Structures are given as C-alpha cells and as structure tokens.
Nucleic acid binder design. Structure first.
Ligand SMILES: [Mg+2]
Ligand SMILES: [Mg+2]
Ligand SMILES: [Mg+2]
Ligand SMILES: [Mg+2]
Length: 122
RNA sequence: GGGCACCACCAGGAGUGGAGCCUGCGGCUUAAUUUGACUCAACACGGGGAAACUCACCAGGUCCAGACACAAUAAGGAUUG
C-alpha cells in the first residue's frame, strides 16, 4: 500500500513543530483562527460534552474554513513528539494533543497541499 | 671577655610628650555604632580620606542567581505576566 492513509496532515504538523509554527491548545488555536496566522485547523473527534469541537467548528466558519477530521488526537501528538528523549525509540508517555492549528507551514507542495485542495473544492 | 648600630649612646640639632585641632586605636555608648591586627615586627595600617555604593553591621523590605537527577500536577493550564 503506497497511498497515504491521511498521512499528509501528520507530516505537516511535524514540520510545523520543527519550525515552531504550531498553535496547540484551544485558546491559541482560536487566536490563530482570528488573525493572519491560523492556516490549517485540527480538531479532536472524541470530545466530552462536544463543546470544544463545536467551538473549533465555529472558528473555522467565522471567515475561512481550514478544518479536518483528526484521528483521536493522541496519535497526532505522538507523531509530533510530546515527550523528551523517550529512551532510544518510541516509548513516549501518551498525551492527548487536544485542538491544534497550523501557522507558517514551512515546507512547500507535496501531498498535504493536494489533500487540502480536496477538502476545499466541493 | 671581644665586637657591631644615631631602629644604641655620646657632641649637638629637630623634636614629640603640654596647648587647640585633625585623624588611628582603646574604653564607654549604641538597634548597629562590620571586621582584621596590639613590644620592636598593632595604633594616617588594611593603599581603610566610609555621605549611599563601598559593606561585611543594625532596622526593615525585595530577589533567586534552588546547576543537574528523579516523580506529583502535565494544557479540564505548569507556572510567567
Ligand atoms: Mg627592627
Ligand atoms: Mg576613620
Ligand atoms: Mg605614617
Ligand atoms: Mg567622605
């Protein structure tokens, strides 16, 4: 299986982390959405009380929609790298990443862009 | 017994010790009147003539500048403002 299984969002996130352009957490994400900063939106599916998700949706709506599904949040966090050192390989203490919004991007083109386009044009 | 030296004395000078005042050091005083050093070899010495700084003392307040290791919160905020 050569085709990516929604692995042109995770990569983007990683890139952002590397270059320091991630609005992780909710307030930060909201802020990003509000001004010329928040370009891609990343909201958790499994949200208790549905409230955070709703908020995120609202934010997305407000001017320009940059949203996507997200696979449980924890996975995303893991991919990003939430934990120092963590032995030789893997073995990171699990953390729920919560709401994330992308600033900067950094890396250009590749499959992420395509995915974004697909999400957009309907 | 024999040497040597105006930090010994002679022969002399200038003196200090008195006077007032500076400044050191005691003693007392004081929250605290920071401390070191008392024969020459402590006492205008600490290059020490302190207005704060210096600064060590006292009365009061501020600050972490608690490197690093390992867990409790680990974003429904750690703590920073
Ligand atoms: Mg002598
Ligand atoms: Mg004096
Ligand atoms: Mg003298
Ligand atoms: Mg003076």
């Amino acid at each position: 299986a050569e085709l990516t299984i929604e692995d042109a969002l995770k990569v983007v996130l990683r890139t952002s982390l590397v270059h320091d352009g991630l609005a992780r957490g909710l307030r930060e994400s909201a802020k990003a959405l509000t001004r010329g900063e928040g370009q891609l939106a990343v909201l958790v599916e499994s949200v208790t009380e549905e409230a955070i998700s709703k908020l995120v949706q609202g934010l997305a709506t407000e001017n320009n929609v940059p949203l996507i599904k997200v696979a449980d949040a924890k996975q995303l966090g893991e991919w990003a790298g939430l934990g120092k050192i963590d032995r030789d390989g893997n073995a990171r203490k699990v953390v729920g990443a919560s709401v994330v919004v992308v600033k900067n991007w950094g890396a250009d083109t590749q499959e992420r862009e395509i995915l974004l386009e697909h999400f957009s044009q309907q």
